[PDB]
Design a protein around this ligand. Structure first.
Ligand SMILES: O=C(O)c1ccc(O)c2ncccc12
Ligand SMILES: [Zn+2]
Length: 438
């Protein structure tokens, strides 16, 4: 049958070397007591301050609340997306940077831990190549952790856990998965903080590993003790799945990643909004939006940017109910700015819609405009329905008022502030009809 192996098994170590040599372990002994102290207290610090939330995530069409409580720390303006949920960094003091005293201290600590792990990770990948010898830049970028996802779980207060289905590894805190949204072949480092027979010891936390598509090959269950670190190197996260097996005591972790944020940063999205608004006459800011060109390429692109800021930025931010306010104000002004920018894009879709009706506009070029924008607008209407439904589902309403989702922006048709209804069913339908006239 399907079994697993631990340090109890004679085969365990050779199985490790032979089948998971890109998984590395650096025991609590390899880390200074000083760093242990600052890191452990920092975790406890963010706990006390209530900085950690279970995410309302999406899996195969279903709203699910992660058993695990989490928080994202890392470079300002940066984001990490998983299970359709874009987490926004609580900022850590990278250079040239400039929210509450203790919380701030905790972030700085996890940055320090970030520095050191980076150093360890580079050292291991160098060792790794010298083994495979029998570029420096690739090594550097693959260890350039711009984030850490902190996790917490107290099995005693969150005992609603699923049994491990293939190897008998027992209760799972995190189910078999690949880590999403990472740079290619980028390492991941994990600092592990536990608070105090046949098979794995159920009282103690483990990380589980299995080869993709493979349940005939015995999985590895590595025991995680207080302050132990381990590293997933090179293509290990692509070639294998991993899980977290729950012990009996609470445990925190810091899981540093190289987030693939090419479309995932404040800077990037602000720049995109700027590009869209290049098609707008910008002398003054008022609700009479006039556009420079109605050339299809440009309008399509403007409507796509409209969508990208609405759903991937605004709705994602407010669906979490602005939990981050508790930790920082960093994103408050940028999200007012992103909404202001988006609101202006609502005037653009609308001037496009005005133009399409305009009396003396040849049907050939009209049809051009429609063909350019149709996909965008129908994607906007489908994504609005979805996010509204994601905001109102039963599991959401059970969240405390400080995490209650916020469907935003959202306006009622009895609102003269917005030039277009929030519901586009009508408009889209008319556009489809026009595009099929004779
Ligand atoms: O160690 C953890 O607590 C952890 C939690 C959730 C994850 O997705 C992980 N992914 C890779 C390595 C560790 C983890
Ligand atoms: Zn993972």
């Amino acid at each position: 049958r399907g079994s697993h192996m631990t340090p109890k098994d004679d085969e365990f170590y050779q199985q490790w070397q032979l089948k998971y040599p890109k998984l590395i372990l650096r025991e609590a002994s390899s880390v200074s007591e000083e760093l242990h102290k600052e890191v452990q207290e920092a975790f406890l610090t963010l706990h006390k301050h209530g900085c950690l939330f279970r995410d309302l995530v999406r899996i195969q069409g279903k709203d699910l609340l992660t058993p695990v409580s989490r928080i994202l720390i890392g470079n300002p303006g940066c984001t990490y997306k998983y299970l359709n949920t874009r987490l926004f960094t609580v900022p850590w003091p990278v250079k040239g940077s400039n929210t509450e005293a203790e919380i701030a201290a905790a972030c700085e600590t996890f940055l320090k831990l970030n520095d050191y792990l980076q150093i360890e990770t580079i050292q291991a990948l160098e060792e790794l190549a010298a083994k495979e010898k029998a570029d420096e830049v690739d090594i550097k970028s693959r260890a350039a952790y711009n984030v850490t996802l902190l996790n917490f779980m107290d099995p005693q207060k969150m005992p609603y856990l699923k049994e491990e289905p293939y190897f008998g590894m027992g209760k799972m805190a995190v189910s078999w998965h690949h880590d999403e949204n990472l740079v290619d072949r980028s390492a991941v480092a994990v600092y592990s903080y536990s608070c105090e027979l046949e098979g794995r010891d159920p009282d103690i936390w483990h990380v589980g590993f299995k080869i993709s598509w493979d349940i005939e090959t015995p999985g590895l269950a590595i025991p995680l003790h207080q302050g132990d670190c381990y590293f997933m190197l090179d293509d290990l996260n692509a070639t294998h799945q991993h899980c977290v097996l729950a012990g009996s005591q609470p445990r925190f972790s810091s899981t540093h990643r190289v987030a693939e944020c090419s479309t995932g940063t404040l800077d990037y999205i602000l720049q995109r909004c700027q590009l869209a608004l290049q098609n707008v006459c910008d002398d003054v800011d008022n609700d009479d939006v006039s556009l420079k060109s109605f050339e299809p390429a440009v309008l399509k692109q403007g409507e796509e940017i409209h969508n990208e800021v609405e759903f991937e930025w605004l709705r994602q931010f407010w669906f979490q109910g602005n939990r981050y306010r508790k930790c920082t104000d960093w994103w408050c002004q940028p999200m007012a700015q992103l909404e202001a920018l988006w609101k202006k894009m609502e005037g653009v879709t609308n001037a496009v819609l005005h133009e399409v009706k305009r009396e003396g506009l040849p049907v050939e070029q009209r049809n051009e405009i429609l063909t350019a924008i149709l996909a965008s607008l129908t994607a906007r209407q489908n994504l609005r329905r979805e996010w509204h439904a994601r905001c109102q589902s039963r599991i959401a309403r059970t969240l405390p008022a400080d995490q209650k989702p916020e469907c935003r922006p959202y306006w009622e048709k009895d609102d003269a502030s917005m030039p277009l209804p929030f519901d586009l069913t009508d408009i889209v339908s008319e556009l489809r009809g026009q595009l099929l006239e004779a």
